[PDB]
Amino acid sequence: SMQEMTLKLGHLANEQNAWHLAAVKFGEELSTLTDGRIAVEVFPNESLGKEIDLINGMQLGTVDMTITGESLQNWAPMAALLAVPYAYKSLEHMDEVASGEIGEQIKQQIIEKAQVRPIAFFARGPRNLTSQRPITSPADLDGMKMRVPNVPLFVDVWSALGASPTPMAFSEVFTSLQNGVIDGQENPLALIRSANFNEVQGYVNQTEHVRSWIYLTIAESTWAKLSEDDQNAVMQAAATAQEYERGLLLESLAEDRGYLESKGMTFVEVDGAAFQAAAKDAVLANVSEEIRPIVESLFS
Numbered sequence: 001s002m003q004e005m006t007l008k009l010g011h012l013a014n015e016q017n018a019w020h021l022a023a024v025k026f027g028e029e030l031s032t033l034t035d036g037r038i039a040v041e042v043f044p045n046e047s048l049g050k051e052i053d054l055i056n057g058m059q060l061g062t063v064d065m066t067i068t069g070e071s072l073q074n075w076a077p078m079a080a081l082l083a084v085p086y087a088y089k090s091l092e093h094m095d096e097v098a099s100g101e102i103g104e105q106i107k108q109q110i111i112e113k114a115q116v117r118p119i120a121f122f123a124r125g126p127r128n129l130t131s132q133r134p135i136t137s138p139a140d141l142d143g144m145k146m147r148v149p150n151v152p153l154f155v156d157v158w159s160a161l162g163a164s165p166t167p168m169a170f171s172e173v174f175t176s177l178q179n180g181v182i183d184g185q186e187n188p189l190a191l192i193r194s195a196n197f198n199e200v201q202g203y204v205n206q207t208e209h210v211r212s213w214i215y216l217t218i219a220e221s222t223w224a225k226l227s228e229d230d231q232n233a234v235m236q237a238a239a240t241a242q243e244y245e246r247g248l249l250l251e252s253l254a255e256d257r258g259y260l261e262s263k264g265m266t267f268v269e270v271d272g273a274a275f276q277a278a279a280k281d282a283v284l285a286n287v288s289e290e291i292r293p294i295v296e297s298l299f300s
């Protein structure tokens with residue numbers, strides 16, 4: 001019937017990735033729930049803008065939605081808790097934290113300090129370090145140039161481990177690797193696949209150094225303009241999308257390693273104890289006082 005608005009939703013994954021399918025599902029559900037009054041347009045591959053630029057856009061009123069996680073720590077320090085190295089044990093553990101009182105505090109700080117509102121969370125597979133030569137322990141890094149996302153805690157940890165990390169937008173990584181500006185990066189298998197890093201990296205080192213969740217978010221200024229009924233529809237659509245997305249994540253766990261191996265990547269077993277000990281020390285040396293007690297709890 002009527003179409004009142006179109007929400008623009010940007011993310012960094014490609015069209016086969018769980019996040020994209022979930023974003024599309026969110027849009028379908030929201031359209032149904034609002035009789036088409038609210039449409040969603042999904043922009044994959046950072047085509048709407050790079051993550052940090054989208055967060056700024058949401059604050060300014062030019063972007064409606066994005067999928068964002070621990071890069072929010074640049075505004076809301078508690079958001080670093082989404083992705084503390086070696087802190088979370090499993091999907092079930094992260095679900096408990098993200099949905100519990102600590103998760104509520106994180107959500108509220110993101111709303112207040114970043115002016116974006118989490119409406120769903122997606123748990124992720126573990127991040128792994130990719131490289132041009134095998135990296136079996138921190139001692140192998142030896143100053144290796146690598147990319148991290150715009151996450152100060154990751155700069156701190158990877159520098160302490162012996163690498164030379166540089167923050168960069170996700171969509172810049174492939175070309176930077178191709179051109180030899182960096183030799184490695186780190187991400188879950190789903191994103192290594194999404195961005196075709198198999199074409200520019202030889203090794204997946206099984207560091208499994210971060211298990212994290214990420215948020216589907218809406219600009220607080222967009223949320224504020226919605227009627228209570230439409231707010232409810234947004235939440236309902238997001239919950240449906242979250243349930244759907246978890247299934248897609250689980251499917252990806254069964255397939256992505258095999259896929260990447262079929263594209264020539266070599267998976268490398270690491271000295272997990274050495275990585276974990278060095279990374280936990282680095283986290284504790286660099287963690288904000290605000291979240292230190294929670295991190296110590298997780299590490300206990």
Ligand SMILES: O=C(O)[C@@H](O)[C@@H](O)[C@H](O)[C@H](O)CO
Pocket residue numbers: 068069070071072148149150151169170186187188191214
């Ligand atoms: O490497 C990346 O850019 C991605 O994995 C992001 O999802 C990243 O985790 C961001 O920091 C999330 O806010």
